[PDB]
Amino acid sequence: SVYDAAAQLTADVKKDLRDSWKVIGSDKKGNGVALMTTLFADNQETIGYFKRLGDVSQGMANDKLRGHSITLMYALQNYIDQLDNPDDLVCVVEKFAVNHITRKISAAEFGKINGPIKKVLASKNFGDKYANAWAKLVAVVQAAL
Amino acid sequence: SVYDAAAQLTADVKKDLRDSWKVIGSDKKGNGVALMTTLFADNQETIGYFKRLGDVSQGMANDKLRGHSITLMYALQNYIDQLDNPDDLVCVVEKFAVNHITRKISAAEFGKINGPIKKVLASKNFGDKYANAWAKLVAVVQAAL
Ligand code: HEM
Ligand code: HEM
């Protein structure tokens, strides 16, 4: 359950999330778009879910993709800001899950974002330690799908 | 159309938006909930769009309502952050409109948020000057609906 998964966010995990986000969240547009393009490159099968975005290969030049990418980063910002209060983190996660459940995005499908996050982190000198911390946060969302 | 509405966001307007947001955005949970509860109290009919939130009379104590309220504030955070670049502000606003268009929320309906905003601002001692600034930001969104 999402409640048990949120309890997996221990002291050090929350700390590593904040330290890495401090850098990653500094450039929401750049890292957000990098995140999306990496997802589409490593998992071409997910492109079907984003038909509305148009030609995703245009990257930054695609206004709809850029708008989506920037917005996506504010969802992560939201998560990070709610780390202090488990009750708030949970209600925010369930709220977020609504539209993804409606699009029929499964926990397994959502989990594909872990690869792109790991690669973006690595490009900023954040190793496995951080990728694993982010995988734990992603697991909270997966628990609600 | 959205670009034209964005043209109304002058240097002075953006300055008042940023200064007021520095305070309003410092307590997203408290002010986000205040915004929603004020909307429902002043325009009871808007509750018809939020059946999923359940018993909205519980206010802050309602996990779903609290989750929605906090999330709403990150959309405003997004907007404030993109003020200095019309191209990004526009793509984020159009991205935002997609789901509200699907919900059949007209520009007139959306405009009902102006009263609650004015009241929340006044609770923090921000006068008409600031209220007019926000009405202009809301107008950009209305142009997309
Ligand atoms: C770090 C993970 C992710 C975050 C934080 C995130 C964030 C968001 C946000 C904030 C929105 C806009 C609000 C909404 O419509 O719900 C959104 C839309 C969407 N998301 Fe997610 N998402 C993530 C991963 C995924 C994945 C892995 C998929 C699918 C494989 C997915 C599919 C969608 C789709 C199809 C849309 C609509 C895009 C559009 O038409 O504009 N998301 N997501
Ligand atoms: C400044 C004003 C507003 C902001 C920033 C805002 C922000 C948001 C955000 C970020 C979401 C979640 C993402 C999504 O599903 O689109 C949302 C959902 C929603 N909004 Fe808006 N919104 C505003 C005003 C309104 C108004 C005035 C109405 C209708 C009278 C409305 C109705 C809805 C509905 C029904 C949902 C889904 C709620 C749920 O079931 O969880 N919004 N809005």
Q: Give the dihedral sign, CA B127/B129/B133/B136.
A: positive
Backbone phi, psi, residue A123, to 5°: -65, -15
CA dihedral B40, B37, A89, A50 (to 10 degrees): 30
Nearest to A64 among B82, B95, B99 (CB): B95
Nearest to B29 among A68, A77, A88 (CB): A88
Half-sphere exposure of A25 (CA within 13 A, CB side): 19
What CATH fold (topology level) applies to the domain A1-145? Globin-like (1.10.490)
Element holding A48 (H helix, E strand): none
Determination approach: X-ray
Which residue type occupies A52?
R
For residue B71, the ligand closest to its alpha carbon is 2
Choosing from B33, B113, B119 the residue with most ligand 2 atoms within 8 A of its CB, the one to mutate for a pocket test is B113
| Cross-chain residue pair A88–B96, CB shorter than 8 Å | no
Q: Is B104 exposed, middle or buried (0-12, 13-18, 19+ CB in 10 A)?
A: exposed
* Residue A49 near residue A122 (C-beta atoms within 8 A): no
Q: Is A30 exposed, middle or buried (0-12, 13-18, 19+ CB in 10 A)?
A: middle
Cβ neighbour number for residue A94 with a 10 Å cutoff = 17
Nearest Cα neighbor of B90 from B79, B77, B106 is: B79
Q: What is the largest CA-CA distance in chain B?
A: 41
* Residue A145 near residue A97 (C-beta atoms within 8 A): yes
Task: Tell me the three-class secondary structure of B67-120, residue by residue.
Answer: HHHHHHHHHHHHHHHHCCCHHHHHHHHHHHHHHHHHCCCCHHHHHHHHHHHHHH
DSSP tag of A127: -
Task: Tell me the three-class secondary structure of B8-74, residue by residue.
Answer: CCCHHHHHHHHHHHHHHCCCHHHHHHHHHHHHHHHCHHHHHHCHHHCCHHHHHHCHHHHHHHHHHHH
Residues A76, A81, A82: CA angle, nearest 5 degrees: 100
Which residue type occupies A109?
E
Q: Is A72 in the pocket of ligand 1 (CB under 6 A)?
A: yes
> Is B68 labelled as part of a ligand binding site?
no
Residue whose pair of structure tokens reads 């923090």 in the numeric block: B124
As given in the structure block, the two tokens for residue A133 are 């911390």
As given in the structure block, the two tokens for residue B50 are 């939020």
As given in the structure block, the two tokens for residue A137 are 């946060």
| Domain parsing of chain B, residue ranges | 1-145
| Cross-chain residue pair A67–B95, CB shorter than 8 Å | yes
* Residue A29 near residue A69 (C-beta atoms within 8 A): yes
* Residue B40 near residue B47 (C-beta atoms within 8 A): yes
